[PDB]
């Protein structure tokens, strides 16, 4: 079983203070894009379903860093889902 | 898991120009970056540049710029730099190394075990 | 060029002791609530392997003996308690901007 739900976080000039694992044609075929680590709301393990307004399905690695640059800074709405 | 397999050691003649490979398995190999390091005794460690396999991007140390070239092939999840004009300066043990540039964070967290370079006539 | 000084060049320390080396950059490397400064052991024959990375965070499966602290142009590499198996070079890393630099490294001697 699993929540979506909706969490606040700060973009800040380097990033969003996570790195993405997962995503479109990564290890396993096609996965969801889920947070591995937190560079120090989100923990290890949520799936990244919206950026702002950028659904992240269907999106690489890469696409997914692309999206995090762009935004801009200050508070950045995210929309994830977690389990149990 | 994660493992970065290099060429094997090479004996190259001045003047000469020579590829090493890195094999990366166990992740998404176009996720992430590839960064060349050289380790001599003269500087012992130094930052070569790194390649993003994705677009095939790359920064490269400028001490390095006519130097090395970086390259990656995606078919075979691997990436290779071709070292040019070769001098015995340029023998060395080279490794790769995997970082990743969320956050631009760029630690070396895997390493290929390193190809020894002897250039010599 | 950012230059990365460490020091001591070489230490020798008891089992059980704290050993503790110190990087200092040429200028500072923290950005954006981010200090880019990584820290490598590295035995012979073998690549470096990360230890600490963006100053303070433990690379997961490394054991809690090693810490690091520091920000901006001062950084610091504690083991406590020294082991045996500590034995090692240690070397800093920034990447803070182009081009990524290492220390000269310390070479790390456990006294019996």
């Known amino acids: 079983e699993a929540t979506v739900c909706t969490v606040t976080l700060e973009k800040m000039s380097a990033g969003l203070g996570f790195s993405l694992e997962g995503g479109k044609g990564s290890l396993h075929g096609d996965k969801p894009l889920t947070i591995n680590r937190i560079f120090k709301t989100v923990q290890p393990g949520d799936e990244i379903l919206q950026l702002g307004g950028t659904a992240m399905q269907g999106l690489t690695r890469f696409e997914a860093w692309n999206i995090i640059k762009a935004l801009p800074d200050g508070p950045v709405t995210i929309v994830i889902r977690r389990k149990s | 898991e994660v493992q970065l397999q290099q060429s094997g050691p090479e004996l190259v003649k001045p003047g000469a120009s020579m590829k090493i490979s890195c094999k990366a398995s166990?992740?998404?190999?176009?996720?992430?970056?590839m960064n060349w390091v050289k380790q001599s005794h003269g500087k012992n460690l130094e930052w070569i540049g790194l390649?993003?396999?994705?677009?095939?991007?790359?920064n490269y140390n400028q001490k390095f710029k006519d130097k090395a070239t970086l390259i990656v092939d995606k078919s075979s999840n691997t990436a290779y730099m071709e070292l040019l004009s070769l001098t015995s300066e340029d023998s060395a043990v080279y490794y790769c190394a995997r970082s990743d540039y969320y956050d631009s964070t760029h630690y070396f967290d895997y390493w290929g075990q390193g190809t020894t370079l002897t250039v010599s006539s | 060029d950012i230059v990365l000084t460490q020091s001591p060049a070489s230490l020798a320390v008891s089992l059980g002791q704290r050993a503790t080396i110190s990087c200092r950059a040429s200028?500072?490397?923290?950005?954006?609530?981010?200090?880019?400064m990584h820290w490598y052991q590295q035995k012979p024959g073998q690549p470096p392997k990360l230890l600490i990375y963006?100053?303070?965070n433990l690379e997961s499966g490394v054991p809690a003996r090693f810490s690091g602290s520091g920000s901006g142009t001062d950084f610091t590499l504690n083991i406590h308690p020294v082991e045996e198996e500590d034995a090692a070079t240690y070397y800093c890393?920034?990447?803070?901007?182009?081009?990524?630099?290492f220390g000269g490294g310390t070479k790390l001697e456990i006294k019996r």
């Open positions: 166990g992740y998404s190999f176009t996720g992430y970056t």
């Open positions: 200028k500072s490397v923290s950005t954006s609530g981010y200090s880019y």
């Open positions: 390649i993003n396999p994705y677009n095939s991007g790359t």
């Open positions: 963006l100053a303070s």
């Open positions: 890393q920034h990447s803070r901007e182009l081009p990524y630099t």
